[PDB]
Amino acid sequence: ELQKENSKRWNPEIQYTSNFEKQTGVDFAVDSQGVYSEPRPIGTRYLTRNL
Amino acid sequence: DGVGNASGNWHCDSTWLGDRVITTSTRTWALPTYNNHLYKQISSETAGSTNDNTYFGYSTPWGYFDFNRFHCHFSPRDWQRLINNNWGFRPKKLRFKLFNIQVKEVTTNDGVTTIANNLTSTIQVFSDSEYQLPYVLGSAHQGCLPPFPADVFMIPQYGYLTLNNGSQSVGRSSFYCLEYFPSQMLRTGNNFEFSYSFEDVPFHSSYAHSQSLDRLMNPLIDQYLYYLARTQSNPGGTAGNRELQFYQGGPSTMAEQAKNWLPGPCFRQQRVSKTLDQNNNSNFAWTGATKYHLNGRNSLVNPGVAMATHKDDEDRFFPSSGVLIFGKTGATNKTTLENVLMTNEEEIRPTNPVATEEYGIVSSNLQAANTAAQTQVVNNQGALPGMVWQNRDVYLQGPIWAKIPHTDGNFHPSPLMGGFGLKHPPPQILIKNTPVPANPPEVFTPAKFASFITQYSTGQVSVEIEWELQKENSKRWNPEIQYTSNFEKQTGVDFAVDSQGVYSEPRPIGTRYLTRNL
Amino acid sequence: DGVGNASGNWHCDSTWLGDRVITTSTRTWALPTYNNHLYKQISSETAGSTNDNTYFGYSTPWGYFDFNRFHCHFSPRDWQRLINNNWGFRPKKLRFKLFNIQVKEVTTNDGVTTIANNLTSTIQVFSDSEYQLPYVLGSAHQGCLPPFPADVFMIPQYGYLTLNNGSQSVGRSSFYCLEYFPSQMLRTGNNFEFSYSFEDVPFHSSYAHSQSLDRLMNPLIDQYLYYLARTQSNPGGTAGNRELQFYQGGPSTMAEQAKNWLPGPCFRQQRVSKTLDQNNNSNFAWTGATKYHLNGRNSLVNPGVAMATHKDDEDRFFPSSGVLIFGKTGATNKTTLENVLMTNEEEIRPTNPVATEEYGIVSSNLQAANTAAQTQVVNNQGALPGMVWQNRDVYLQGPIWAKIPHTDGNFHPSPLMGGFGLKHPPPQILIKNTPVPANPPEVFTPAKFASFITQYSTGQVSVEIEWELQKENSKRWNPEIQYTSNFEKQTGVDFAVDSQGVYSEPRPIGTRYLTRNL
Amino acid sequence: SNLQAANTAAQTQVVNNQGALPGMVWQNRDVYLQGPIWAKIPHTDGNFHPSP
Amino acid sequence: HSQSLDRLMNPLIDQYLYYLARTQSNPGGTAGNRELQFYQGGPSTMAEQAK
Amino acid sequence: NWLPGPCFRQQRVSKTLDQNNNSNFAWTGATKYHLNGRNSLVNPGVAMATHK
């Protein structure tokens, strides 16, 4: 069950995003040998809210 | 609904109806233009304040209405009725109105100022009934409806703060435009209205306990439980050798008896006397205070956990920052002791620990044949299974409610200044003058418009609340303590005006007069 | 409907409802008197402009409303929602209102200016819902509803141009009187309204392709088709004699494989670097530009066919006139490079050719035993059977729509600045102050009346649009690129006000963030 | 830590641990794509804010 | 959260509650003798305010 | 995921007279609380285990 956000913030928020520049491999994919890997940890607290 | 028609009447009244009381209030307000119709970023850089005082935020051109004080609704005679005859109370319903709107334009010239009516200007009002804006109420700010009904008041300016790193902002700072809401526009001849329901909340305790927590036994019978009395049986001299002796519950040894209930938590503060030749010759209002620490900043614990002010026979003492302090009539922001009014929470001495003393004593080691026992003083203590405690009182000139912060966990969410803690409190009402531009040039310019006509507005406001009463059901035989007026002659009446026309309140009035068996 | 009654409320909001989003906006305007209630003929003779700049037209006393920009309707947070979660969108319905009208008279005297209310003056509004007047919108003019809702704006003056021969007119030049239309007159207490339906139009592509057009094969298998590989079989030395050798589709030779689809058309422009010590020491902003030729005049190709800005690793380059350029906060009309904001169309590199490079190579002759082969570089190319291409992106601070010219033929009528091309666009709304003559003489004169009272008017405007969303349906396993805010500390917030009260937009924001398999 | 007087300076003590006090508000720990989802609360007589 | 717990006030208005500011009123030198002085909630003193 | 309960540590006393210290500490070295200027033995208090 999802709880949707209902914010009146005027300016844009912080969002989780992928890399933009060139690398040797893709994050969250396999390498030339067939091994899956996860680069970093990903949390959940990106949107904001008035305490 | 025109220029020559009133859109509301005056309603100031009180109606006691058994288990309910209904109050109604009406006042006259005035609203200037704030910030020149601009939003402005504010910071602590202008202040040159310290790291603890560092802040980053915004200021807006809107005002807001504030009636979060008991004297906005109760007159002193009504407060006396309530606190002398009831054990508890709480709010039920609210109703709000704005009527008889007037808008004026101001022209200054040659040092002569003129004022005329503007019949076609509007104002903008809305309620934040979904709690999307920062809730700025509930911080004990000035700008309330005045206690005396014949007084005219000025509406305060609205602003807020967001996250900062020094005098900087961070990527999580939020900016808010209030014009991004739906508002209702009012010319003269229009009015505004809304109603609200209070969620279910506990009654405020308007009583004092008439027993103490360590004296809940029968003083004539003994107990069937033993306690360790002696360890070194001394027959009279130094020849006392080891022996274990256990006693039986007795009336004289009230303390040496099994109990069932502990006192509440503590956060021990510094003691300060009302005698300058009793306090230490040093400045320790900040270095020796009680603080908390959050994100590299310090902040005074003010007022904090509800504790008793002083013990028996020690009324001249008080904690550094553990009481509410109001000011007498016409005081400055920087003031001495004979011009302030301090409260007393010494009616909760039966259950809550004294603020300036320690909680208790615990052990620190394990004694042996050749090691004496050791103890350690407990100057702070959180919740333990078995604890009971009271809350802080409310005053005729104090706050009514606070908004509980939306978090994952809280613990006993009573606001520490006193009042009713609400997850969905009465919403903020914001009001503004609609800008009227002066004459623009006759050739188009994209430059930002900045020439305006000076305006302000005035009108009437009313607010009405229904409260639920809890009546007392006591079998006390002898008479009780009651709040009462003076009997002897003075120069003036308390809670009235003087020869110059100034209203004043002499003392603070609490609620805990009737008693109750703990 | 009187002097003391508001005829509308404030409505600024957004409502996301699944496959639709509805936006609403309200602003405050001011309208001066233009031209002294006169129509005037204008020409390039006063300018002393060149043959290319020669023009002949008219100017009118009417103003007009303009909201053909995305930030008139979307706030930056809403634009972020839209571009981070959707593959496409398009407009559906429109609604327009004008309310709370106020008219004022201005008296100047002794250097003292006074302003009073005129309760019996009117204004004149109408919509050109049959498209009989020249459509002046859709040329990226200033005079829009401001991006920040708390800003007051001035309405622009309306005029148009017709056919000219130098600074002269010809027998086919058209003059237009706007009073020759039916309008609606509004005193204070009246309001105005109309609605419109958008014709059926394609969704805007809010995605970037994740494959390229020359890489649509399987990289493990070979083809069943041969291509000519060698012509002079060289066994290692200069003794190579004639021989025809054909190869088979291989993974290494991706380019040497039969395909099915060509890139789009091109109109190759000049390359300009962001390094002054990399650009040539000469002025070539006009002599070496890309132009078209129409009726003896030249005109810059600006911005023109949608092409990619730069190739890989070459982000410091850009075409001379092949991108959109906005200005930072508070810039003049003549400006240097560190005060402008340039866009990047490099996300259409998978299908569209780079702007500053050539299309391809073709042959020029017929080789023989004693004639070497020759080629020729193709710097321009129209449509060929097999071509696929993308359109230019839209920006939060760019235009929304354009009117397609009524002609006999067009080709892919997407407007070259970006947006939705419409044969029946939202009509122009024109507004004017009704003239109030001063006191005439007391003896009749046929001479033309020329004494008027100075007036201007102010009021509120609102506009509401409903958009249709196309949701994304992707099976990508790894995460996508998303527009995001800064994370570290700065002095101010992006898309907010500074300490002086000025709103500003730091960067341009496009729409192509999510991806899609070509 | 003490009670100051005319001839006694004030003293303090640093609080390195603290349980629940009336008035406290707090957040919980975040969850991660590669972390646990749930835990079983132990069957006892009392708990306090049983978030794992 | 986009606000902090010690910054939930309005930064333009003052409070109607006093706090103990000084104990040894120093007129500038070492001749400061005992005196109790109470202040009023101010924007600069965010920490010195009832919460 | 789970911590033990609260504590109010008390003095240890052995059932061997030649193991307990040669002194009377049934009141001076006890565990008390303080309420309105009076002291009172914490008896029995928070539920804790008797011995290890």
PDB file of C-alpha atoms in Angstrom, chain C residues 181-341:
ATOM      1  CA  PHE C 181     -15.556  44.067 -34.104  1.00  0.00           C
ATOM      2  CA  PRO C 182     -18.204  43.348 -31.475  1.00  0.00           C
ATOM      3  CA  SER C 183     -16.784  43.806 -27.966  1.00  0.00           C
ATOM      4  CA  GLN C 184     -18.163  43.525 -24.456  1.00  0.00           C
ATOM      5  CA  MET C 185     -18.040  46.563 -22.174  1.00  0.00           C
ATOM      6  CA  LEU C 186     -17.241  46.122 -18.481  1.00  0.00           C
ATOM      7  CA  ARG C 187     -17.667  48.518 -15.628  1.00  0.00           C
ATOM      8  CA  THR C 188     -16.471  47.611 -12.162  1.00  0.00           C
ATOM      9  CA  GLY C 189     -18.639  44.750 -11.005  1.00  0.00           C
ATOM     10  CA  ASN C 190     -18.696  42.988 -14.396  1.00  0.00           C
ATOM     11  CA  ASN C 191     -16.568  40.035 -15.504  1.00  0.00           C
ATOM     12  CA  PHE C 192     -15.640  38.137 -18.662  1.00  0.00           C
ATOM     13  CA  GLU C 193     -15.228  34.479 -19.590  1.00  0.00           C
ATOM     14  CA  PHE C 194     -14.705  32.038 -22.458  1.00  0.00           C
ATOM     15  CA  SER C 195     -13.592  28.463 -23.147  1.00  0.00           C
ATOM     16  CA  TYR C 196     -11.801  26.653 -25.953  1.00  0.00           C
ATOM     17  CA  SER C 197     -11.022  23.097 -27.054  1.00  0.00           C
ATOM     18  CA  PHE C 198      -7.675  21.996 -28.441  1.00  0.00           C
ATOM     19  CA  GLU C 199      -7.819  20.056 -31.684  1.00  0.00           C
ATOM     20  CA  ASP C 200      -6.276  16.605 -31.819  1.00  0.00           C
ATOM     21  CA  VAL C 201      -2.479  16.765 -31.747  1.00  0.00           C
ATOM     22  CA  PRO C 202       0.402  14.331 -31.200  1.00  0.00           C
ATOM     23  CA  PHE C 203       1.957  13.814 -27.788  1.00  0.00           C
ATOM     24  CA  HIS C 204       5.256  15.577 -27.211  1.00  0.00           C
ATOM     25  CA  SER C 205       8.129  13.108 -26.970  1.00  0.00           C
ATOM     26  CA  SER C 206       9.434  13.388 -23.401  1.00  0.00           C
ATOM     27  CA  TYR C 207      12.032  10.631 -23.768  1.00  0.00           C
ATOM     28  CA  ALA C 208      15.489   9.986 -25.170  1.00  0.00           C
ATOM     29  CA  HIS C 209      16.325   7.010 -27.367  1.00  0.00           C
ATOM     30  CA  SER C 210      18.600   4.347 -25.872  1.00  0.00           C
ATOM     31  CA  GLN C 211      19.702   2.815 -29.178  1.00  0.00           C
ATOM     32  CA  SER C 212      21.267   4.479 -32.202  1.00  0.00           C
ATOM     33  CA  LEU C 213      20.113   4.186 -35.788  1.00  0.00           C
ATOM     34  CA  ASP C 214      23.283   2.573 -37.152  1.00  0.00           C
ATOM     35  CA  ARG C 215      23.371  -0.017 -34.330  1.00  0.00           C
ATOM     36  CA  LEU C 216      20.049  -1.873 -34.611  1.00  0.00           C
ATOM     37  CA  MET C 217      21.490  -5.315 -35.425  1.00  0.00           C
ATOM     38  CA  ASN C 218      22.210  -8.481 -33.468  1.00  0.00           C
ATOM     39  CA  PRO C 219      25.918  -8.424 -32.526  1.00  0.00           C
ATOM     40  CA  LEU C 220      26.396 -12.221 -32.530  1.00  0.00           C
ATOM     41  CA  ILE C 221      25.062 -13.454 -35.890  1.00  0.00           C
ATOM     42  CA  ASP C 222      26.069 -12.769 -39.483  1.00  0.00           C
ATOM     43  CA  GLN C 223      24.016 -11.550 -42.427  1.00  0.00           C
ATOM     44  CA  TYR C 224      22.955 -13.415 -45.548  1.00  0.00           C
ATOM     45  CA  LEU C 225      23.868 -10.455 -47.795  1.00  0.00           C
ATOM     46  CA  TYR C 226      27.239  -9.599 -49.331  1.00  0.00           C
ATOM     47  CA  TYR C 227      28.880  -6.257 -50.021  1.00  0.00           C
ATOM     48  CA  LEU C 228      31.805  -5.245 -52.211  1.00  0.00           C
ATOM     49  CA  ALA C 229      34.941  -5.280 -50.059  1.00  0.00           C
ATOM     50  CA  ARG C 230      37.988  -4.903 -52.321  1.00  0.00           C
ATOM     51  CA  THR C 231      38.656  -3.803 -55.896  1.00  0.00           C
ATOM     52  CA  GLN C 232      42.455  -4.154 -56.166  1.00  0.00           C
ATOM     53  CA  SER C 233      43.518  -7.380 -54.481  1.00  0.00           C
ATOM     54  CA  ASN C 234      46.839  -6.524 -52.868  1.00  0.00           C
ATOM     55  CA  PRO C 235      48.758  -9.688 -51.903  1.00  0.00           C
ATOM     56  CA  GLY C 236      51.091  -7.477 -49.860  1.00  0.00           C
ATOM     57  CA  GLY C 237      53.027  -5.342 -52.322  1.00  0.00           C
ATOM     58  CA  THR C 238      52.416  -3.103 -55.340  1.00  0.00           C
ATOM     59  CA  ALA C 239      51.695  -6.116 -57.576  1.00  0.00           C
ATOM     60  CA  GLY C 240      47.990  -5.991 -56.727  1.00  0.00           C
ATOM     61  CA  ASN C 241      45.870  -6.451 -59.848  1.00  0.00           C
ATOM     62  CA  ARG C 242      42.142  -6.122 -60.419  1.00  0.00           C
ATOM     63  CA  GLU C 243      39.771  -8.446 -58.545  1.00  0.00           C
ATOM     64  CA  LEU C 244      36.248  -8.224 -57.119  1.00  0.00           C
ATOM     65  CA  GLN C 245      35.837  -9.631 -53.605  1.00  0.00           C
ATOM     66  CA  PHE C 246      32.596  -9.705 -51.621  1.00  0.00           C
ATOM     67  CA  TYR C 247      32.301 -10.191 -47.833  1.00  0.00           C
ATOM     68  CA  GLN C 248      29.540 -11.367 -45.416  1.00  0.00           C
ATOM     69  CA  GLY C 249      27.934  -9.315 -42.581  1.00  0.00           C
ATOM     70  CA  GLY C 250      30.161  -9.589 -39.473  1.00  0.00           C
ATOM     71  CA  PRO C 251      30.005  -8.151 -35.899  1.00  0.00           C
ATOM     72  CA  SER C 252      33.293  -6.183 -36.315  1.00  0.00           C
ATOM     73  CA  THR C 253      32.050  -4.570 -39.595  1.00  0.00           C
ATOM     74  CA  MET C 254      28.853  -3.001 -38.112  1.00  0.00           C
ATOM     75  CA  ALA C 255      28.989  -0.136 -40.690  1.00  0.00           C
ATOM     76  CA  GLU C 256      29.518  -2.559 -43.645  1.00  0.00           C
ATOM     77  CA  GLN C 257      25.997  -4.098 -43.316  1.00  0.00           C
ATOM     78  CA  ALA C 258      22.660  -3.567 -45.172  1.00  0.00           C
ATOM     79  CA  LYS C 259      20.432  -1.426 -43.244  1.00  0.00           C
ATOM     80  CA  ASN C 260      16.765  -0.186 -43.367  1.00  0.00           C
ATOM     81  CA  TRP C 261      16.713   3.489 -42.050  1.00  0.00           C
ATOM     82  CA  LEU C 262      18.385   6.911 -42.825  1.00  0.00           C
ATOM     83  CA  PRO C 263      19.001   9.955 -40.613  1.00  0.00           C
ATOM     84  CA  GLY C 264      17.021  13.152 -40.989  1.00  0.00           C
ATOM     85  CA  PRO C 265      17.625  16.243 -43.103  1.00  0.00           C
ATOM     86  CA  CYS C 266      20.337  18.842 -42.545  1.00  0.00           C
ATOM     87  CA  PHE C 267      21.141  22.527 -43.189  1.00  0.00           C
ATOM     88  CA  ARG C 268      24.773  22.685 -41.933  1.00  0.00           C
ATOM     89  CA  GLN C 269      25.751  25.719 -39.810  1.00  0.00           C
ATOM     90  CA  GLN C 270      28.991  27.279 -38.601  1.00  0.00           C
ATOM     91  CA  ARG C 271      30.764  26.002 -35.495  1.00  0.00           C
ATOM     92  CA  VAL C 272      31.646  28.394 -32.670  1.00  0.00           C
ATOM     93  CA  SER C 273      33.712  27.542 -29.601  1.00  0.00           C
ATOM     94  CA  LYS C 274      33.274  28.757 -26.048  1.00  0.00           C
ATOM     95  CA  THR C 275      36.975  29.632 -26.027  1.00  0.00           C
ATOM     96  CA  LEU C 276      37.930  33.037 -27.391  1.00  0.00           C
ATOM     97  CA  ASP C 277      41.456  31.717 -28.044  1.00  0.00           C
ATOM     98  CA  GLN C 278      39.921  28.952 -30.123  1.00  0.00           C
ATOM     99  CA  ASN C 279      37.620  30.997 -32.323  1.00  0.00           C
ATOM    100  CA  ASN C 280      39.066  32.750 -35.357  1.00  0.00           C
ATOM    101  CA  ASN C 281      40.191  36.376 -35.021  1.00  0.00           C
ATOM    102  CA  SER C 282      37.490  37.927 -37.189  1.00  0.00           C
ATOM    103  CA  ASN C 283      33.866  39.034 -37.068  1.00  0.00           C
ATOM    104  CA  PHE C 284      31.790  36.401 -38.880  1.00  0.00           C
ATOM    105  CA  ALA C 285      28.485  36.495 -37.007  1.00  0.00           C
ATOM    106  CA  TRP C 286      26.742  37.698 -40.150  1.00  0.00           C
ATOM    107  CA  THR C 287      28.964  37.196 -43.197  1.00  0.00           C
ATOM    108  CA  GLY C 288      29.550  33.511 -42.508  1.00  0.00           C
ATOM    109  CA  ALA C 289      26.059  32.624 -41.298  1.00  0.00           C
ATOM    110  CA  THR C 290      23.253  30.395 -42.581  1.00  0.00           C
ATOM    111  CA  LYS C 291      20.507  32.335 -44.351  1.00  0.00           C
ATOM    112  CA  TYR C 292      17.499  31.986 -46.598  1.00  0.00           C
ATOM    113  CA  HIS C 293      16.442  34.299 -49.420  1.00  0.00           C
ATOM    114  CA  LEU C 294      12.903  35.587 -49.975  1.00  0.00           C
ATOM    115  CA  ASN C 295      11.844  38.461 -52.259  1.00  0.00           C
ATOM    116  CA  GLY C 296      15.290  40.039 -52.401  1.00  0.00           C
ATOM    117  CA  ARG C 297      15.848  39.979 -48.630  1.00  0.00           C
ATOM    118  CA  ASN C 298      18.043  37.775 -46.459  1.00  0.00           C
ATOM    119  CA  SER C 299      17.157  36.440 -43.035  1.00  0.00           C
ATOM    120  CA  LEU C 300      19.097  34.405 -40.498  1.00  0.00           C
ATOM    121  CA  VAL C 301      18.135  30.734 -40.193  1.00  0.00           C
ATOM    122  CA  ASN C 302      17.318  30.889 -36.493  1.00  0.00           C
ATOM    123  CA  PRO C 303      17.050  28.281 -35.055  1.00  0.00           C
ATOM    124  CA  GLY C 304      16.041  26.096 -38.000  1.00  0.00           C
ATOM    125  CA  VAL C 305      15.920  22.351 -38.524  1.00  0.00           C
ATOM    126  CA  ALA C 306      16.385  20.357 -35.321  1.00  0.00           C
ATOM    127  CA  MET C 307      19.937  18.994 -35.224  1.00  0.00           C
ATOM    128  CA  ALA C 308      22.291  17.869 -32.481  1.00  0.00           C
ATOM    129  CA  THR C 309      24.388  20.585 -30.877  1.00  0.00           C
ATOM    130  CA  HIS C 310      27.742  18.787 -30.667  1.00  0.00           C
ATOM    131  CA  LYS C 311      29.249  15.318 -30.908  1.00  0.00           C
ATOM    132  CA  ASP C 312      30.958  13.252 -28.210  1.00  0.00           C
ATOM    133  CA  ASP C 313      33.595  14.994 -26.089  1.00  0.00           C
ATOM    134  CA  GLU C 314      32.939  18.343 -27.804  1.00  0.00           C
ATOM    135  CA  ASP C 315      30.506  20.086 -25.465  1.00  0.00           C
ATOM    136  CA  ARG C 316      32.375  23.411 -25.719  1.00  0.00           C
ATOM    137  CA  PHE C 317      31.162  23.915 -29.313  1.00  0.00           C
ATOM    138  CA  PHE C 318      27.812  25.141 -30.592  1.00  0.00           C
ATOM    139  CA  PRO C 319      26.317  26.290 -33.903  1.00  0.00           C
ATOM    140  CA  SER C 320      26.155  29.991 -34.672  1.00  0.00           C
ATOM    141  CA  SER C 321      22.349  30.207 -34.775  1.00  0.00           C
ATOM    142  CA  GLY C 322      21.122  26.704 -34.029  1.00  0.00           C
ATOM    143  CA  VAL C 323      20.103  26.770 -30.353  1.00  0.00           C
ATOM    144  CA  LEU C 324      17.792  28.653 -28.025  1.00  0.00           C
ATOM    145  CA  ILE C 325      19.445  31.248 -25.795  1.00  0.00           C
ATOM    146  CA  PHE C 326      17.795  32.700 -22.698  1.00  0.00           C
ATOM    147  CA  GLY C 327      19.190  35.387 -20.409  1.00  0.00           C
ATOM    148  CA  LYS C 328      20.104  35.182 -16.741  1.00  0.00           C
ATOM    149  CA  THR C 329      18.447  37.372 -14.127  1.00  0.00           C
ATOM    150  CA  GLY C 330      18.588  41.055 -15.011  1.00  0.00           C
ATOM    151  CA  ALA C 331      20.465  41.223 -18.307  1.00  0.00           C
ATOM    152  CA  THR C 332      20.499  43.985 -20.913  1.00  0.00           C
ATOM    153  CA  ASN C 333      19.687  43.672 -24.609  1.00  0.00           C
ATOM    154  CA  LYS C 334      23.407  43.726 -25.474  1.00  0.00           C
ATOM    155  CA  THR C 335      25.265  41.168 -23.391  1.00  0.00           C
ATOM    156  CA  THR C 336      28.348  38.924 -23.160  1.00  0.00           C
ATOM    157  CA  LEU C 337      28.581  35.141 -22.782  1.00  0.00           C
ATOM    158  CA  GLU C 338      28.602  34.710 -18.989  1.00  0.00           C
ATOM    159  CA  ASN C 339      25.092  36.207 -18.744  1.00  0.00           C
ATOM    160  CA  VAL C 340      23.111  33.920 -21.078  1.00  0.00           C
ATOM    161  CA  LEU C 341      21.708  30.397 -20.826  1.00  0.00           C
TER     162      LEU C 341
END
